[PDB]
Design a protein around this ligand. Structure first.
Ligand SMILES: Nc1nc2c(ncn2[C@@H]2O[C@H](COP(=O)(O)OP(=O)(O)OP(=O)(O)O)[C@@H](O)[C@H]2O)c(=O)[nH]1
Ligand SMILES: [Mg+2]
Lengths: 181, 300, 141
């Protein structure tokens, strides 16, 4: 067998719990589960190779940052899922999340994810961020964040629609499986 | 249904490389929502900023172009802004869900009973003296003796503009002017609508190379109720070409005029009325009185 | 009337042990939970060791206060309140000073722990303090 130490980080309540519980248990958290952090294991096939995944719903909280930084050592990949609905999460990724993780552990593969992808053309989140004076993360903006953090790829997921989930985590597997230049 | 419309005035197109004569009116679409509930007053709150999804005429030629290979045989023509606003009206009659993708607006609604006074008396907090007022283009079931108004809603409806020599159907801007019995244009005479002052002469929308465009464009008219008895309107139909010097130097290829009084004295009977667009001598068509002597419209 | 959230998503720690954030069951007798925690660090001797709030209290969790572990409340394994009490006492009646200083500051701090106090009072290590500061002067003066 093979399970990859994959810690998933991102701002508080931005879908880390949601996307991970969509991937591991295949149910969308309807309410915000307050992550402290949860260590899962799942099984999936990536491009013809079955693999186990030792995963982490890790805290968006700065408070359990330390506890999440406790998951920082030994970690083989950093799946950072930022809210498309909260480009402030984009900012904290390009200011804290990716910085903090590359400071405790540089050169580790990092997979950038746009959570709540279903909301980009959806009227609700558009108008919300507009009355919030912000724009839901356009795919090229997430590409810019990925190249910024030198991410393996920017992948968009909708935990509400189970969208992008399995592909995102197959990518998280393959990034350690086959490193990219 | 409450229906709003947007015309992008300014330049003929949002394309870089050439200037366009600033203030070029280009249609930008419509938003509609039923108000059968809103009229009945069920949604009763000042604070409800109803976001309304706005749909433009479908300019759907951005992502579909890139991926069509191994069997290319297609030539399609431009009706994506040549699309009729009558047709867009029919669509939004049918259309229930608007994938505006953020292009929309916000409105806070109520219904206040009583007349303009009570509107500006019982709820002047909503409606001060400076608050904008719109009136149904119609008449009331109750008539006060002395219902002093002089509104004349004049609606550009549609018109055939044959290409002629120009393969591009002439990019018709209609520009009509309110004159005395001496061709003398009057200022402010044409009122674009509510909450805004009238204008001396009015300019239509430039339909992008349309041979039989349809306007639905209505303007308020109000004149001295006795001087209107001796006034007329005259009309310039000009090909707003994309070249600024050419655009301004382009003249009204089309000429028209109309009188406000039937020579008997009656005001023109309401309803639809047709027009011949005029070419040729414009000194014949720019004379304070001679074109008055000339015939102006189809039926006459 | 209800018991607490019987399955609590908490970190479990131990000196030298990387914490593991497991979903601890709480209706189980706490001896077995200590057993599994010890086993997590490849340890036996569960009754010889106590979990405690890795938070400020350091109060060795008994069957009594296990309702006080919140989601995120880190638990840390250590020697049981009896084993802390004893380690103390044979360090306490002893004479080697700096060791007494450390154990003595720590007996101060941990005295308020009822869970520890049970076995340190069963033990009679306070009379061992009586030794260390009434004889322990004259052994060394
Ligand atoms: N509609 C929609 N909501 C989502 C989606 N993904 C996450 N959410 C929202 O995210 C909220 C909080 O859950 P998570 O994002 O999983 O919380 P988290 O990212 O783990 O952050 P912390 O638990 O605070 O560390 C939920 O209430 C969901 O509404 C999505 O794909 N679609
Ligand atoms: Mg989380």
């Amino acid at each position: 067998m093979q399970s990859i130490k994959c810690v998933v980080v991102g701002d508080g309540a931005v879908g880390k719990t949601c996307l991970l519980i969509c991937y591991t248990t295949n149910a969308f958290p309807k309410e915000y589960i307050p992550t402290v952090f949860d260590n899962y294991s799942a099984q999936s096939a990536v491009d013809g190779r079955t693999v186990n995944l030792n995963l982490w719903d890790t805290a968006g909280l700065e408070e359990y940052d330390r506890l999440r930084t406790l998951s920082y050592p030994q970690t083989n990949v950093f799946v950072i899922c930022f809210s498309i609905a909260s480009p402030p999460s984009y900012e904290n990724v390009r200011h804290k999340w990716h910085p903090e993780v590359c400071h405790h552990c540089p050169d580790v593969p990092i997979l950038l994810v746009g959570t709540k992808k279903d909301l980009r053309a959806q009227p609700d989140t558009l108008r919300r961020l507009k009355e919030q004076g912000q724009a839901p993360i356009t795919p090229q903006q997430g590409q810019a964040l990925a190249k910024q953090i030198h991410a393996v790829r920017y992948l968009e997921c909708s935990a509400l629609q189970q969208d992008g989930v399995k592909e995102v985590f197959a990518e998280a597997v393959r990034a350690v499986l086959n490193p990219t230049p | 249904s409450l229906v709003c419309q947007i015309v992008r005035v300014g330049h003929m197109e949002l394309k870089e490389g050439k200037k366009h004569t600033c203030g070029l009116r280009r249609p930008f679409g419509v938003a509609v929502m039923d108000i059968t509930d809103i009229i009945h007053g069920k949604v009763d709150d000042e604070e409800k900023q109803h976001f309304i999804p706005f749909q433009q005429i479908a300019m759907e030629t951005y992502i579909r172009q890139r991926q069509l290979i191994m069997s290319p045989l297609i030539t399609s023509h431009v009706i994506g802004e040549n699309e009729p606003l009558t047709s867009v009206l029919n669509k939004v009659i049918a259309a229930k869900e608007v994938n505006h993708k953020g292009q929309g607006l916000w409105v806070s609604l109520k219904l206040l009973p009583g007349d303009l006074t009570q509107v500006q008396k019982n709820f002047s907090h909503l409606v001060d003296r400076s608050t904008a007022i719109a009136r149904k283009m119609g008449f009331p079931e109750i008539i006060l003796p002395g219902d002093v108004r002089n509104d004349i809603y004049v609606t550009l409806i549609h018109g055939e503009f044959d290409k002629g020599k120009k393969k591009t159907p002439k990019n018709v801007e209609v520009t009509m002017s309110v004159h005395d019995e001496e061709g003398k244009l009057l200022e402010k005479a044409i009122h674009p609508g509510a909450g805004y002052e009238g204008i001396s002469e009015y300019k239509s929308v430039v339909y992008y190379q349309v041979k039989q465009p349809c306007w639905y464009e209505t303007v308020k008219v109000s004149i001295a109720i006795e001087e209107v008895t001796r006034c007329h309107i005259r009309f310039t139909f000009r090909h707003r070409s994309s070249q600024e010097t050419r655009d301004k130097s382009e003249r009204a290829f089309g000429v028209a005029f109309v009188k406000l009084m039937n020579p008997d004295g009656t005001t023109l009977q309401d309803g639809r009325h047709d027009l011949v667009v005029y070419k040729g001598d414009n000194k014949k068509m720019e004379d304070a009185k001679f074109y008055l002597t000339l015939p102006g419209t189809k039926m006459e | 009337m209800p018991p607490p959230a019987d399955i609590v998503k908490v970190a479990i720690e131990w000196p030298g042990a990387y914490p593991k954030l497991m979903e601890i069951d709480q209706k189980k007798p706490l001896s077995a939970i200590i057993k599994e925690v010890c086993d997590g660090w490849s340890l036996a001797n569960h009754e010889y060791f106590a979990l405690q709030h890795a938070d400020s209290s350091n109060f060795y969790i008994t069957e009594k206060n296990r309702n006080e572990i919140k989601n995120g409340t880190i638990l840390r394994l250590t020697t049981s309140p009896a084993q802390n009490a004893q380690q103390l006492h044979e360090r306490i009646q002893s004479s080697s000073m700096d060791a007494k200083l450390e154990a003595l500051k720590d007996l101060a701090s941990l005295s308020r722990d009822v869970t520890f106090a049970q076995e340190f009072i069963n033990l009679d290590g306070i009379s061992l303090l009586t030794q260390m500061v009434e004889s322990g002067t004259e052994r060394y003066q």
